[PDB]
Structure formats: structure tokens, C-alpha cells
Nucleic acid binder design. Structure first.
Ligand code: NA
Ligand code: NA
Length: 327
DNA sequence: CCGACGACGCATCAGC
DNA sequence: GCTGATGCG
DNA sequence: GTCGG
């Protein structure tokens, strides 16, 4: 549905969501508003009243009332007020820095630190993650065109294979589903020597190599199984440099790899459905394993999984291409 | 009425 | 110093 | 804030 249909309503609900998360620290209200915004955004009719919207799942009495106020007046008094509230709008803004969450944003604003300029003047008050989030503030808010994601994938797969040709690497997320753009890069990594029953350095050796070839530029966090950092494609001598991009790399045991690839490929709606179907078939699926459920509901040992298809076969579902996992 | 609403890796804090 | 809690994503 | 046991 065109954004002109209910974009006013959905924009209002998304703004209310952000204030719940970042200012009121009410995460379940943030998700309530997002859920409302999503079901309205997919509604293929320009809404005429709150009662109409309340028929939708996730829209209740309070949001119906707000929609009535918005349709009648073109705005929402409470949103107008918080928008111009210097403290609340500054707290909400600062959480756009990666590493600054609601608690840090509140603490900063409490001591007069309200803008990117104020953060730049107060480096010693920022931790390592927050300094990187500030350094790449604008780059991190840009989307990644699919052509750049392919070039990024070219580098990851080549360097991974270079370290050890027995590594297996898969770039998941919307990109694997075919998306024309991405917000970041999610790489899932495994190695036949790493199973749930049985090296460190498996992840470090890959991160190191990507740093040696100057693809990974910064690290946000790094442990034995999860890396979160920054990468950047090489710029042709003489062309504008590519923005810096967020990349995550996860090391997963081989016997849990394809469960992980399935989960992190998504979509979220699709996983909810598959997990719903799996239950009504006698199986429980999480990001790690698929396990059978006994007649009293006791989950048994995880079942062998050697491919994505294996998971579909267990639950009597035809294999769906990532391209067809929108829901 | 009133609890669920995602679990978890990593960085860093709070407490001992 | 070690252990658990909290923040963040 | 919404849903539902
Ligand atoms: Na409803
Ligand atoms: Na943030």
C-alpha cells in the first residue's frame, strides 16, 4: 500500500514508539506501537476512523482514540508537545548513536550533553562502542545497495576460504532473501572442527584476515563466537569512498549451523509461521535446534540437521527458497 | 484482572 | 581480583 | 498498549 494511504497514522505511531523506547524506557509499549504501525502499514485502505483500525490485531482502544484525534485535527497534542520538549527530544535523538541506548542518552542529557557536537567535545565520557557510533553516525544510517552487498560478500567469502578452505560462510538477512538493499551485513560462519560437543581462534583468524586486507576497519565487540564491527569496501583510486558499514560475524557449531542460517535469513514473520507449524507437527524449532515434542510436551534430543531442507522435511513442509520467505 | 510481550553474547558496571 | 547485573544490540 | 488466559 502506498505510503500516502496511512503514512500520517503510521509515522505518528512510529514516533510514539521511539519515545516509549528511548524516553519512557517502556520497551513493550515501543513494540505495541510498532506492531500497530506495521498492521496499519499493510492495510490496503485509507483508514476513516479509529473504530475501523481497531478491527486490526494490535490496534486497541488507545490507538483508535489517537487515530481519531489525528484524522480530525491532523496532529496529536501529546506528540506535538513531546516533539518540542528539549530534554525528551534530545534523549530520543542521542539514541541514534550506536552504543547510546536509553540509559546512556538520559545520563548524557542530564549533564547537558544533548547534541552530536556535545558528544564530540566529551570523548572521554564515551565508551569504545559509542565513540565508533559517533564517528560513523551518518554512514551507519545509510542503507547498503545490493550491488555493494555483493562486492562485500565477494570479499568475505574469498578471505574466509583463504584462511581455511573448510570454513563455511553464509551472508543471511534480507540480502539472502533477495532484498535490493540492506541495513548491515550478517555473516554466519562454521567449520567442521567446531560442533556442540567439540577451537578458539576459529572466529579470530577470520576477523584478523579481514583486518589484514583492510576490509574490517573497527571493532565494536569481539569474543570467541560473536564479532560486531565496521567494514568498508575499497575505493577506486579517484572515486568517492564508500561509507563505512556495520558487519556482524557469528561462529556457530556445525550441527547447529543450518538452524542458524534458517533463523537469521528470516523473515521474522516467516519464522513465526514456521515455528507455529512445527509445533502443530510435534516439533520445537529455535535458532539452534529442532527437537521432537513427546505426548506430554517434553522436548527430546535435538534432531540431526545437515541442510536447511532437512528442517523443512522434519515438519512436512516443501522447501521454500529464501526469496519466498517474506512470510 | 493482570502477566507476557525473545534469548543471549559481549562490554562494562556494581558489589563483594 | 571474582561474580552477577545491567545496558546494548 | 494490546492481547488473552
Ligand atoms: Na484490534
Ligand atoms: Na543507540
Amino acid at each position: 500500500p502506498q505510503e500516502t494511504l496511512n503514512g500520517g497514522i503510521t509515522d505518528m505511531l512510529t514516533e510514539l514508539a521511539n519515545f516509549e523506547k528511548n524516553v519512557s524506557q517502556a520497551i513493550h509499549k515501543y513494540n505495541a506501537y510498532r506492531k500497530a504501525a506495521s498492521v496499519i502499514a499493510k492495510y490496503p485502505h485509507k483508514i476513516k476512523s479509529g473504530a475501523e483500525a481497531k478491527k486490526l490485531p494490535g490496534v486497541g482502544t488507545k490507538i483508535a482514540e489517537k487515530i481519531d484525534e489525528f484524522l480530525a485535527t491532523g496532529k496529536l497534542r501529546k506528540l506535538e508537545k513531546i516533539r518540542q520538549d528539549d530534554t525528551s527530544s534530545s534523549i530520543n535523538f542521542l539514541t541514534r548513536v550506536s552504543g547510546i541506548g536509553p540509559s546512556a542518552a538520559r545520563k548524557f542529557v542530564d549533564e547537558g550533553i544533548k547534541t552530536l557536537e556535545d558528544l564530540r567535545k566529551n570523548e572521554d565520557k564515551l565508551n569504545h562502542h559509542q565513540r565508533i557510533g559517533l564517528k560513523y553516525f551518518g554512514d551507519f544510517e545509510k542503507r547498503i545497495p545490493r550491488e555493494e552487498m555483493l562486492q562485500m560478500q565477494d570479499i568475505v567469502l574469498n578471505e574466509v576460504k583463504k584462511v581455511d578452505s573448510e570454513y563455511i560462510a553464509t551472508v543471511c538477512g534480507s540480502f539472502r532473501r533477495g532484498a535490493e538493499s540492506s541495513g548491515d551485513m550478517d555473516v554466519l560462519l562454521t567449520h567442521p572442527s567446531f560442533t556442540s560437543e567439540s577451537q578458539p581462534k576459529l572466529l579470530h583468524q577470520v576477523v584478523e584476515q579481514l583486518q589484514k586486507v583492510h576490509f574490517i576497519t573497527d571493532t565494536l565487540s569481539k569474543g570467541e563466537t560473536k564479532f560486531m564491527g565496521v567494514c568498508q569496501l575499497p575505493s577506486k583510486n579517484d572515486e568517492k569512498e564508500y561509507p563505512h558499514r556495520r558487519i556482524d560475524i557469528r561462529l556457530i557449531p556445525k550441527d547447529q549451523y543450518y538452524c542458524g542460517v534458517l533463523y537469521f535469513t528470516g523473515s521474522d514473520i516467516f519464522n513465526k509461521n514456521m515455528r507455529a507449524h512445527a509445533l502443530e507437527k510435534g516439533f520445537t524449532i529455535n535458532e539452534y535446534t529442532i527437537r521432537p515434542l513427546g505426548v506430554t510436551g517434553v522436548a527430546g534430543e535435538p534432531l540431526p540437521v545437515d541442510s536447511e531442507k532437512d528442517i523443512f522435511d522434519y515438519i512436512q513442509w516443501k522447501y521454500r527458497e529464501p526469496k519466498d520467505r517474506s512470510e
